[PDB]
Amino acid sequence: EQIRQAQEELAKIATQLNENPEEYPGHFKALARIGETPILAIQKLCIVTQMAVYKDVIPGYRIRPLGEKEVKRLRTYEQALVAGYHGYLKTLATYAASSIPEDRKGEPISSIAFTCACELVNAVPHFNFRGDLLRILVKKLSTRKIDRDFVKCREALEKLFQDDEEGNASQEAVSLLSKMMKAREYRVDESVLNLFLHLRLLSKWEFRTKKQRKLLKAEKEAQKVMEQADATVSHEERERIQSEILKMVFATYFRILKARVPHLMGAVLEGLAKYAHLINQDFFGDLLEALKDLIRDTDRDTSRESLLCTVTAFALLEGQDAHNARSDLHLDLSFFITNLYRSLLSLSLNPDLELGNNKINLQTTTVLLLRCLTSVLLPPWNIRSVPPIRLAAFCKQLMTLALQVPEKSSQAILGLLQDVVHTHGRKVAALWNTEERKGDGTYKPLSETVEGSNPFTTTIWEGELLRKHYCPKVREGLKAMEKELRSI
Amino acid sequence: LIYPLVQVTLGAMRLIPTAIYFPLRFHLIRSLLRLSRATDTYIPLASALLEVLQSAEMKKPPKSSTLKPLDFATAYKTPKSYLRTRVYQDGVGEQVVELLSEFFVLWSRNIAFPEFALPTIVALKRWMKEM
């Protein structure tokens, strides 16, 4: 068939350019015209072969436009390379945007175009027309419709972000993603936001003549001074591109928070918690203040958003750098601890507690509650310097929580207090012993502050309801806590 | 067979929380209270009853209508006439009061009643304040 004839020409050009590419600069245009045949069979074969050859022939550097014997032939070959690559990317872009549904004879031409574009992104990012290549991928990621091509484009950008060591390819993609997110009014699939989380920038005696020996000695000294200067310039350029990406990444994060996109705030807060330590100190205190405003706005669904911010606030301080700067930067989580305390009673009555490697973006509100409680009562730092009053206030409120929550939520809280009793012990033992009860006031359940309530003046009585709870796991869970208490 | 029974009971309970199935939801509570009262097992309905009370219709003002109040012992759904009717919101209103009292009177003697009833009391004062 004519496909056999076309296949022969494809094999001819590709092998011919592989062996000696300079001699035949017109094969790039030859690969073009035979691609405008109107049979879909050859068009699929032409596109793949063009991807194969260009990966073989693209050099390790960009080539400038000329404008204005062996030198002249290299100029002609390089100019032919750019012209073909520019034309190839235009053809790939048109096919990718073309209609996908066709006859069920296999993957359409669009799927091959995405496959070809993804391979070029991970193989030749440094070369010219990177934006035209990246615009094909980003245009696919702006549709909110998951298919095989959507995953393939996402996986390609994930690889590019975490293998970019210079930063130029990452910056150009981040600018495209940020602009697209704003242009779509943040109606994206939140897998594009997770791409920001993958940024790596943000984490034999050969004889030698008399003259031959003198040239190498001169070359070595020239290379030594160039290496020293290259090391210095590399540090400054890496830091500058990091600042530019940090500007675009953080600006997108805040604009989502201001517009309050419900399906993106979990992803945004993970990014803020991940990358807050890379920015200026004076902005770190602002992040906590911005979190407080979001919680106060929800205080005016809503339960999850306030719990998301509280998880982020503690995760911000759990970092070693932020922990050592507690006193210096005035990072007080007293607001979040109090707010988490006054919300425990309301969270019990909420029926949607169960309607559902990440540290912030978690789908279950009960899980978010457990993460906050672990931060307050079992911090990574200073676990045995926690104020006893704070421990007692939450312990009493948590038994009240366990009374009126679904079986699994009650079991989770029961297990949590088992660890709290085990790690601290005598700080909360008097709550289960009536003789050790304090007699310097009356217990205040609905206090506005943790210390305002007098929790050592009460006794944990809830065991007499949870011992007859319908769930055997809860009953065994309660028995687990007393076994720890009896072993204190 | 107590654990599997109330699991599927609360499951068929919490399938779709809508006004159409409020009488259906009400009957499932009564089955649970009877099981808990005959035995001595704890079944938490405080969220279930209060979720009834915090739906849209008892917040929105009703409409003036006149017809026969429905008997809450033979219905699995709500006829379309009751969507904003004064009669319906009263009809559920007597119910939510009744099962709340029945649930709370069961555990009205155990050592830990004040804490068992504390979150419900705060919720009810809150709901009264908004109404």
């Binding site: 978690l362 899980v367 297990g415 | -």
Partner: peptide, 20 residues
């Protein structure tokens, strides 16, 4: 220990303990 094990999101599917 126990708090971390119950804090993972794959604890709260909804599987009934009659259909093990």
């Amino acid at each position: 220990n126990k708090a971390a094990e119950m804090s993972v999101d794959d604890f709260f599917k909804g599987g009934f303990e009659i259909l093990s």
